[model samples]
Target: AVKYYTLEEIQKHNNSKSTWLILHYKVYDLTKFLEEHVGGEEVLREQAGGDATENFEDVGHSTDARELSKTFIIGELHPDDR
Candidate 1:
């Protein structure tokens, strides 16, 4: 079964310890990824624990970047919350 996370639950992770965010309605953990961000960590920090689809899509990440995000994927937004 797929894990589901609520917006409120996700919001609590908005910090250096466990930064998380939603992109295309899926959650991705960006804590460990902070150092590897090519665009720099500023952008990731701004979107921590919430919807980041617009910014992420706007950045025009390449296919390779998209592929990396899959590895960080923890779950999807809860249907009731979305």
Candidate 2:
């Protein structure tokens, strides 16, 4: 099973120090991913420590983005908050 993170805890990670965001109720720790990403880096930060599902979809992500996104995924969002 994957780890489950709540909104409260996710928000605590607010910032590049430990940037985290949700995409479709899934948790992604993009601490390093953010700096490595040249695409919409600012946009990612805009939604950091929060759900970024919509903003990400707004980009019509490239085919390769998924594989990378999947890699960054550490857990699913905890149902308690979702």
Candidate 3:
């Protein structure tokens, strides 16, 4: 079954060691992507544990980025946030 997480729960993982991000109502665990991020770690770090949809979409991520994101998906946003 698909998991879901609240904004509060996602906020707790803001740190570099456990970065989580919300994008288009989907939750992603990006900790493993820190060193691999093409935009650099700081960009991701700045958006950790919060909605990064605007930033992510503004960047116009390539097909590779979209595919890469699937590998990190951990859950979805709570219904309240959808």
Candidate 4:
């Protein structure tokens, strides 16, 4: 069960937050990254308020990056939602 969020919602949610892991060798704005990521920003958009791991493998991001990405997420809205 994924939830979609608008840019405004993302901004509101991450105004002063930062991702716990690095991407491309840099720590960046996770919210902004969600908007510009090449792997498919829409996935992040759809999962804005919840987990979206099911669509992850199909998105075609690097395995290492995906693993790293998981580290930065605070937690999923649903424990067994994935």
Q: All predictions: root-mean-square deviation over Cα?
A: 0.7, 1.2, 0.9, 9.3
Give the Cα error of residue 22 in candidate 2, in Å: 0.3
Number of backbone-clashing residue pairs for each candidate, in the order shown: 1, 0, 0, 1
Ordering by TM-score: 1, 3, 2, 4
Highest TM-score scorer: 1
Q: lDDT values of the candidates?
A: 0.92, 0.84, 0.91, 0.43
Measured against the true structure, the TM-scores of the candidates, in listed sequence, are 0.96, 0.90, 0.95, 0.42
21-75 per-residue lDDT for model 3 (tens digits) = 9999999998988999878999998998899999999989999889989999999
Which candidate would rank higher by lDDT, 2 or 3? 3
Expressed as tens digits, the lDDT of each residue in 1-82 for candidate 1 is 8999999999999976899999988999989999898999988898897899998898799999999899999999999998
Summarize candidate 2's per-residue lDDT along 8-29 as a digit string, tens digits: 8888987658888999999998
Locate the minimum summed-lDDT window of 10 residues in model 3: 14-23
Where does the lowest 10-residue lDDT sum fall in candidate 2? 34-43
Question: Which scores higher on TM-score, 1 or 4?
Answer: 1
The window of 10 residues in a row where model 1 has the poorest summed lDDT is 41-50
lDDT of 4 at 54: 51
Q: What clash pairs does model 3 have?
A: none
lDDT of 4 by residue, 1-82 (tens): 4432333333344333432222222222367576557666554555443333455555567877867665454332322321
Regions of model 2 farther than 4 Å from truth? none
